[PDB]
Amino acid sequence: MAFRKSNVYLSLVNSYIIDSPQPSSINYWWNMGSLLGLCLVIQIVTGIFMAMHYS
Amino acid sequence: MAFRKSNVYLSLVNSYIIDSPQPSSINYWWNMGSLLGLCLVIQIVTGIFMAMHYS
Amino acid sequence: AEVTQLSNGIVVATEHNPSAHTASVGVVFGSGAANENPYNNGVSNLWKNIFLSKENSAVAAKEGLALSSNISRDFQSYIVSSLPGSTDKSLDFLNQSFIQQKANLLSSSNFEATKKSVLKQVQDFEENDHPNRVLEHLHSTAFQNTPLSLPTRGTLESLENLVVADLESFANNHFLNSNAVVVGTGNIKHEDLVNSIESKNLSLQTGTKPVLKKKAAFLGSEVRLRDDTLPKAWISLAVEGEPVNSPNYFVAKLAAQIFGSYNAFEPASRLQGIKLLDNIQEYQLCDNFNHFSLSYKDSGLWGFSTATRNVTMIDDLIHFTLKQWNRLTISVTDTEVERAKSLLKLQLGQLYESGNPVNDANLLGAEVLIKGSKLSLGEAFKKIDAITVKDVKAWAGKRLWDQDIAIAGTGQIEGLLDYMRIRSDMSMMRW
Amino acid sequence: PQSFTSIARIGDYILKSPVLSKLCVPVANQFINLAGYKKLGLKFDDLIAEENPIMQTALRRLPEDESYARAYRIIRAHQTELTHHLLPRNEWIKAQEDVPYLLPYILEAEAAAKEKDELDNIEVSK
Amino acid sequence: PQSFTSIARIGDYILKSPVLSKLCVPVANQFINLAGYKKLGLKFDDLIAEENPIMQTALRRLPEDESYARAYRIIRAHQTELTHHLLPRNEWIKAQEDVPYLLPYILEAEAAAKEKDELDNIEVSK
Amino acid sequence: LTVSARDAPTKISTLAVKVHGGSRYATKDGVAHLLNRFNFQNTNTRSALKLVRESELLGGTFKSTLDREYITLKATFLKDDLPYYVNALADVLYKTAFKPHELTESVLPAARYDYAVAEQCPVKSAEDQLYAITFRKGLGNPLLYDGVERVSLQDIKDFADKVYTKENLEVSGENVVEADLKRFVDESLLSTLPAGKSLVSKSEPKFFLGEENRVRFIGDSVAAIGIPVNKASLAQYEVLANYLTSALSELSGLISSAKLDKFTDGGLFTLFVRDQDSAVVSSNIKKIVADLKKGKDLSPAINYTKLKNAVQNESVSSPIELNFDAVKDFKLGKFNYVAVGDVSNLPYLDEL
Amino acid sequence: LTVSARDAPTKISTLAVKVHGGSRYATKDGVAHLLNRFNFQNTNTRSALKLVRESELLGGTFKSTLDREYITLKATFLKDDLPYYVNALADVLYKTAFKPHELTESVLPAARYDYAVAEQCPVKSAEDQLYAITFRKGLGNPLLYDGVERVSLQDIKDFADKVYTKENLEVSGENVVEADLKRFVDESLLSTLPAGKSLVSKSEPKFFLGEENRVRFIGDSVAAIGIPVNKASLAQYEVLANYLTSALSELSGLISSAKLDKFTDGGLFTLFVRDQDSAVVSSNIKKIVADLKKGKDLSPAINYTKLKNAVQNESVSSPIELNFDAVKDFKLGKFNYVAVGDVSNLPYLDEL
């Protein structure tokens, strides 16, 4: 089989990101969960760079 | 089947803590990995309670 | 081992073999299933069976004569076989019952009985012969809305509305001296066949067959015929290939021979020098496959067909096979080319030197109708031994690398992924 | 790791040579007695690591009667070791019983993997 | 959720009653036309949620010919909805075709689950 | 050791070694089928992988076949490479390895596949039964291995020593220079094989008439008859077979198959009726037997049989049955019968 | 409608309904086996679950059995609860539901299990074959359903209407007051069944002698013989069966089984020889037949047979074969034969 399916760590990426079966009819209202994950990355990264200068 | 095997979250506890097959002959040198996990909990908890008073 | 052609208004080809025990004589026409329309599709398959019906085969059996026929996309055949000292009787039967009189054959009773049997043949084919009906469906999605899409047996719906008038119309338009070749194989001399023909006069019709409005064109597409109750999945996949009378005719055949054919249950077939087999055998993703390179007058196809019981790992089978194809552009070795050279010679050396004169006649008549002449087997070998690695890489870079595909499948094909994830595997990204 | 084909090539050279065998064999015998795997009831071929394809192949080709005994020696040794005792001295493997019962199956599987693998990377003449 | 046994008990009471049926039926018909599931080519029993054991049982007991047609109506409706179109008006489900084809299989599986459950918690006399 | 060859101007050659080692000489049920699957495995001097790879680069392939009288080892190749394939077939007959892991991994799973494929065909089942009730322990032995009798590796190795003997062989070539084939054969290892003896019996076999067997089976139904044939009556039954399938016959549409199997000490005529409805099978087979018992003239099918016989005898040494001149007439005597399928609705022997 | 009962001072009662609806009356192969598995399923008035739960609290169970002549519906219960079980068996014969999901979920998987269990026993295979070659389409019909003939739900429902008819029934009770059983039966629903007719033939059956059959099988080997018996010769063969298994015989150690099956229009004597080595099976069966063809005196086994017959006829209406007085002598005439297993090493009929 393919490496993306055999490796312990990439197997989880493949099953969640690459080969995951999705219904054919989902609309753009199903895209908000992706955005909330980018939001959490924006806040954690911007906050750690400010904490270097905060008292 | 038992609830500890059917639930999404307890199934992981059962497979890692309860029903995990272990060799019959392992000695006390195989106990250090458990201690390193308690160590990390001691340091994170004690450190957060001090950070409340640190400048 | 040489063929001899003459012309009198009637083309006469012959491959004499003095050490054979039979002789075959027939007529080949240059019209097939790619010379009819969606309304009269199957009229040629019904012409074949009128030739092979009882009262015509009885009349031949009383004289010691056997009959045969074949329908393809570019040509049709009507052949008579006999013992070597009985060839003038073969020509007479072919004259009387076929070219001159046929009101005996197109009667009202013989036509209905023939139509009943042919409908049962086609209905049986569509319910039980899965590898062959998927390859016919491949032709119909690749060349849709074009003459090279129509099935050779006909379709059960178009075959029901045929009458004798459809047969007579098709005969007047295509069974013509300008569109015909008279053949002779086995223990038969060219001069004797020429002499026997001019003793008679032997002409069918004059000529002027119709020209075909549309030319064949390839289109990337897919057709899925899902049936969850069958125990396997059957799939075929191809790209556009080479026609007959192309400069890249033998290079495409060599490239198909590199990947070859496989049977999982035969021990010696598991030991072939094919690098794809190192990937499938560890989880056993298929039972068999075969690579083809098909060629017609206007276009061609290059690809493979497979059957498998492992319905949860279809995506690994298609993926690994298409990645091996990529290597023909990048990294094909010299050993893989020298192996395919000598196995291709053995392949077509067995096709052109079998012992059956019936197969000889079909091959000879089809080649002379296109090229006017037959290329000998000693000449074809020299073209194959002159191919290099550079010729293969140049051919593959033009015909395979990032090109559109056609796909057909039936059975348990839930695990066959969408078009664009298969199309993306035709290039690597890592070159 | 090192191949058993290479281990056997070096060993056979040492053994065929008279001077080297008189000099290297007594060292090897007392290396065996100091190791102490016989005192747990094991032959040496029980100790070879089995998580690789050449060694998985050799264990399938092994007869049934020799395979059942191997499983028992391995279970008995695990139990002897969790109790931190040794076996009775009348249950120790003797020297004449410590035979290479699995080596021929290993050398046969190795020679076939090398032949296959040379054939997949051949340089052809013209 | 509410049982189809209870849904049928309330409905039958409304329908047998003349005054209530003349008052509640026209509201129910135009509730059906405003919903718009026929315009995608679906009958109502296609819409019932199927992730529960009583409903999994009813779908096994369904004949093969009715089951193949249900699968096609559901695929056709998903494709109609991702394109954001409606079907042609000559392919809409008509009223006489919108029949409860699955209700008898549901009521039979529900009545058996209640009988089994009462028998597992019985109070016995002496 | 008998050698023979015919030349031609072609490109492809063919070489064959024939051994009287088929099922009718088998010590146990299925030992000739297994031996058939051992050849072209590893040799004492080279492996089965290297043989496939070397011959592919030269342009050639190998094949082995089994029937009730012969095991045939065949090679097909390009004309110039003759001495390579002579030496390869010789080593197969001389020094095959016969290792236990080959039996477990390759040979037995292949024999299992052959059997499982054949036992889904009811016509092939009817054919074994007719061979089993007509003849008993020679021609009637089973063809394929099914496991009802245990066959070990030493049993296979003892059978090979029995049948691979210099006086039991035939070497034949198509498009081969006979003077050069004889030279390469005498210098090969199959000139060193042990001289044993031939196993062909010049007795005739013993047969039985008036037998019957029924078998239950899910699928299509079959009804078949069988007649033994001696050497003098052989041309008569060949004409009958081709007559009954040709368009000269009124009942050729009711029959599925008819043939005559030829051996050097007789033959067996067989006829088959197959259909899915079991009332069709019964109505047909009763018409076939009622009409054949009354008589048929066969002289109209003499020249049609001469054609067919010449066609199927093309690449073959041809037991010469050149006596179709004196054939006229056939009337059905006594025969055997088998039924397969829905046997509760198929006829019995003494109501035919 | 015939009723009968015998009282006792015991605690447990037993009630049985017997119907001439066994395999010898079956329209298609296996329709009586399937009907046997439909009864005690859901009724129009109560479910199969409630029947099991209600009767458990009263102390009773139900059972249904099939043989070649009878379908028997049986109940076992505590003495006082008679009218409950009379009404329960009546509703089974009257208004069984016959729903399609019961066939798919319960009945067919159970019939599949019965068949798969039986086809692993070679003695039971030999017994069906002897019934199939001796008799053909009555007593020789198959017992269990195997699927070679497709049986639908309407076929089952039409068979039930054929055999569940008031003139085809027998009601019998053990430890039951006959005067009260008659009262409860006349007021039950089985007094409302349609009056059809009895299916017993008072003709004798037609039989055949001198037949043979061989079957290949992995496992143990069997050799069996069978003789048909008319009503007048019935006491003679009963003595023979018990003689050949008793210690009065020299060859009782070579036999595995021997019995006589009794019907109201004759019987079938059967004998079996079973072993794992196939040379043992052949050496024994040839000694059995050679010794029985010469003659045996049976008068020493008259009183031993009277004991055994009284033992097995304990709870039974007993076709009275009380004529062991006139039995002396038996000599083997003609018979049928079957072989199962390694049939390449088992004897043939005309060498016994």
Ligand SMILES: CCCCCCCCCCC(=O)OC[C@H](COP(=O)(O)OC[C@H](O)COP(=O)(O)OC[C@@H](COC(=O)CC)OC(=O)CCC)OC(=O)CCCCCCCC
């Ligand atoms: C920093 C603090 C961290 C806390 C824990 C550290 C523990 C690490 C010690 C190293 C180790 O884990 O291996 C110890 C090893 C013995 O392991 P073994 O399984 O082979 O023998 C099981 C025993 O026989 C049965 O012991 P049993 O289970 O029967 O009784 C328990 C024993 C408690 O012993 C322990 O806690 C082990 C740490 O009860 C008593 O001792 C009674 C006296 C009050 O002993 C040796 O092989 C050599 C030991 C000397 C070298 C130690 C130097 C380390 C720097």
Ligand code: HEM
């Ligand atoms: C879910 C993630 C977070 C949320 C929703 C959040 C929210 C906020 C908000 C609402 C403020 C006040 C904004 C204002 O100035 O008006 C704030 C301030 C602040 N946050 Fe966070 N925060 C998040 C994560 C973090 C993390 C991980 C850190 C440190 C590593 C951090 C560090 C700070 C600091 C230093 C300030 C000081 C005031 C400023 O710089 O604006 N934040 N945060």
Ligand code: HEM
């Ligand atoms: C792997 C976990 C950690 C390790 C190994 C570690 C290590 C240390 C060490 C060696 C010191 C200096 C000790 C000294 O005073 O001599 C220190 C100081 C300190 N650490 Fe951590 N630390 C860990 C986690 C944390 C976390 C998670 C926090 C905050 C939430 C924290 C907060 C502090 C603070 C406030 C000090 C100030 C000096 C003191 O209070 O001793 N530590 N740490």
Ligand SMILES: COc1c(O)c(C)c(C/C=C(/C)CC/C=C(\C)CC/C=C(/C)CC/C=C(/C)CC/C=C(\C)CCC=C(C)C)c(O)c1OC
């Ligand atoms: C329907 O199916 C879906 C699906 O549709 C989608 C969109 C996703 C993808 C969507 C997600 C929401 C998953 C994404 C994951 C998260 C949101 C968790 C993020 C967790 C964190 C711990 C984020 C922290 C990020 C860091 C970069 C921390 C490190 C900080 C650094 C490097 C800055 C400080 C460093 C220096 C040197 C100053 C799915 O996983 C999925 O499942 C099958």
Ligand SMILES: COc1c(O)c(C)c(C/C=C(\C)CC/C=C(\C)CC/C=C(/C)CC/C=C(/C)CC/C=C(\C)CCC=C(C)C)c(O)c1OC
């Ligand atoms: C071999 O089998 C084993 C095994 O042997 C062992 C030992 C373990 C056990 C565990 C480990 C080896 C390590 C795993 C440990 C972690 C991932 C540690 C995470 C650590 C933390 C410290 C999380 C802390 C989070 C908090 C919210 C606490 C911090 C602060 C608080 C509560 C202050 C706030 C309070 C108030 C009142 C405001 C296994 O899991 C295991 O399975 C494989």
Ligand SMILES: CCCCCCCCCCCCCCCCCC(=O)O[C@H](COC(=O)CCCCCC)COP(=O)(O)OCCN
């Ligand atoms: C949910 C929270 C935690 C779980 C996180 C899961 C998702 C994380 C995504 C990780 C990205 C991929 C990481 C590396 C993938 C390749 C690993 C590999 O090749 O395995 C090893 C190399 O070993 C390593 O060095 C691991 C380094 C880990 C790097 C830490 C980030 C070789 O590959 P291996 O043979 O083991 O794979 C088996 C398939 N045949």
Ligand SMILES: CCCCCCCCCCCCCCCCCC(=O)O[C@H](COC(=O)CCCCCC)COP(=O)(O)OCCN
């Ligand atoms: C996140 C770190 C990465 C590693 C994974 C972490 C896994 C460790 C988790 C530790 C165990 C937590 C105990 C869960 C208790 C059982 C949950 C349960 O009852 O499931 C649900 C109810 O749970 C809830 O409503 C919310 C639970 C929130 C828990 C937040 C801690 C019961 O529902 P159900 O019976 O269907 O079981 C699920 C079957 N898949």
